[PDB]
Amino acid sequence: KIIYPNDLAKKMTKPVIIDCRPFMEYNKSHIQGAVHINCADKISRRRLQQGKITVLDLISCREGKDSFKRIFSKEIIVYDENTNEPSRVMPSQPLHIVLESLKREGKEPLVLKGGLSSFKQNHENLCDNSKE
Numbered sequence: 001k002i003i004y005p006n007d008l009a010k011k012m013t014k015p016v017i018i019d020c021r022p023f024m025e026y027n028k029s030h031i032q033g034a035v036h037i038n039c040a041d042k043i044s045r046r047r048l049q050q051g052k053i054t055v056l057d058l059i060s061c062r063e064g065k066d067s068f069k070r071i072f073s074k075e076i077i078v079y080d081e082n083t084n085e086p087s088r089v090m091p092s093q094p095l096h097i098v099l100e101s102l103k104r105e106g107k108e109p110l111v112l113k114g115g116l117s118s119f120k121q122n123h124e125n126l127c128d129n130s131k132e
Contacts, residue, residue: 018078020094077110
């Protein structure tokens, strides 16, 4: 259920990547290609928590033809700002929300060990930073 930065780097060069930080952080900087899931907004937060909207949906509904089947086959990487151990993620954190939602949808997500903090250490090159 965990993956190391350098490990994520290899796969990024050889998977879906989901950013669980506040939208403002995401815009300042995030992993290239990463999708941001809104857990800040109550409507969105609740809707994801009540299983009314699926995370896979938020990703697939923006792509194409075999989008859904393809995503279900890929590995899903989810990352925080600096979380190290998933088992110790409080039920209130977006990371936990997105995580429970993915399991529910039938996928076994991987957590970026150390979050972005640890990733940007040697892979700032793989992040998109914004002009702001």
